[PDB]
């Protein structure tokens, strides 16, 4: 176990291996957020028998700390891909604050890349594995209500973001055209950009956002959402990354689609720089 709730020390001349897809911490966070989700049950007190009885789901930066006998190592290389040996590594008592945001397609309120846009993956050949993209410059998205709702994005900032992401994806597939298409199918949770905002689940259609084909100012995009749990409701989130899934490689093109659904991908995007070891 790893206890969930400020000191750090660098380890001079130490090299320890990290594996993005084999991380006991990502397994831990997945179980802990599942446990907190399951608390949509009535609390209980006791007088004679089991007598059955704050909707503040709003995320707060939580931390994962090392219990006695265990330590947490952190990779200080800010371009670290997730898998392989890290040269610059330190012992930290607790991980940085992590807002446990459960969104699909777009990663909201996370940490930005240090430098350029980063594909957080040693290799993206495996089509089954989700591609975690980390953006260096954030993109605002205002979602509002008066059932149904809508979201707005700057447009010139969005189609610019996808252009810089397509150039950086083309580094992995040189001499290949990079295309984006909407989600190919499945449940509404994954086919749309879904997320929780003050007791409300949104399901925003992203077909207009992901329909670009890249060869080798005050305008906005408005996307419609379905709502399922005040008259007016609003969220002003910040897109910090994307979750993509690659189709089967065709002739001279590579198609990417917004992915999600696996809640472990959301925790991989933040915990890719940590590892639990024994003291």
């Amino acid at each position: 176990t790893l206890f969930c709730a400020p000191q750090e020390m660098v380890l001079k001349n130490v090299t320890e291996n990290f594996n993005m897809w084999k991380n006991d911490m990502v397994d831990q966070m997945h179980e802990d957020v599942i446990s907190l989700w399951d608390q949509s049950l009535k609390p209980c007190v006791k007088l004679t028998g089991g007598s059955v009885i704050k909707v503040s789901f709003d995320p707060i930066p939580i931390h994962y700390c090392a219990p006695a006998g265990y330590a947490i190592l952190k990779c200080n290389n800010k371009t670290f891909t997730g898998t392989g040996p890290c040269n610059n590594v330190s012992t930290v008592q607790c991980t940085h604050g992590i807002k446990p945001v459960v969104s699909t397609q777009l990663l909201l309120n996370g940490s930005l890349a240090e430098g350029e846009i980063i594909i957080r993956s040693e290799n993206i050949t495996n089509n089954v594995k989700t591609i975690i993209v980390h953006l260096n410059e954030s993109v605002k998205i205002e979602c509002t209500r008066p059932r149904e709702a809508y979201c707005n994005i700057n447009e010139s900032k969005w189609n610019e973001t996808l252009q810089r992401v397509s150039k950086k994806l083309k580094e992995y597939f040189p001499h290949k055209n990079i295309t984006f298409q909407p989600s190919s199918g499945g449940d509404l949770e994954i086919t749309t950009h879904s997320f929780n905002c003050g007791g409300e689940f949104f399901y925003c259609n992203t077909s207009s956002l992901f329909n670009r084909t890249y060869m080798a100012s005050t305008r906005t995009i408005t996307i419609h959402c379905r709502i399922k749990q005040a008259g007016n409701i609003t969220c002003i989130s910040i897109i910090t990354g994307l979750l993509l899934t690659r189709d089967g490689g065709k002739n001279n093109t590579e198609t990417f689609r917004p992915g999600g659904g696996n809640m472990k991908d959301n925790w991989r995007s933040e915990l890719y720089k940590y590892k639990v070891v024994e003291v």
Partner: antibody
Amino acid sequence: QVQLVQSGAEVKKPGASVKLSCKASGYGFTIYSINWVRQAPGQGLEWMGWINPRNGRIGYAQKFQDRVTMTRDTSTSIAYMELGSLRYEDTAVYFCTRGQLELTASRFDKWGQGVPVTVSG
Amino acid sequence: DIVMTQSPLSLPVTPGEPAAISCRSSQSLLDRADGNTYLDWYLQKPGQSPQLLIYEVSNRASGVPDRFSGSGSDTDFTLKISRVEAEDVGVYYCMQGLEFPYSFGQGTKVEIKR
């Protein structure tokens, strides 16, 4: 205990569609994938695509991309695969198989008994 | 497509003696983001559906007898049988599970030498 039962045998005319079933039982249906693999008579094996029965995510083989639809019904642990615009070259036995999720959809550890699908006039 | 090349296509074996089948892929099957090598060995006995023998190069599937064994690295793989029993007759296909489409070898017909 772990079984993958399939729907007998079908005969369809050229241009038509088929919807094959694959009833899973004896294990956690949503914690394992369902892949479909076909076999022409006397020929080898050909993978068609996968599905994540938990959320419905799919990934098809490029040659079947715009003519196949894989879906599931978690209320009955049944997995479907619909192949449209049938050509005579689709006459083959169609198997469904249990695979992995997250790291890969491979490691076909359990298999259905197959369904012959003749395509002819 | 990652073409999978099996050698040999035919293999008659006197029962009790050992057998080996090679599989060679046009690309590496090591998932560098994971550390795992996605290669499986399937057996299709006559008039039956296929079945898993080995997964990820060397791991035996449940029930598979210790006679069967896998080995190899990166691009060359070998399924080995120590004692070729009567039940082992069938077509053996290697298979990569790394990139779409998942591709199989052409098959190896193992039969009794007479």
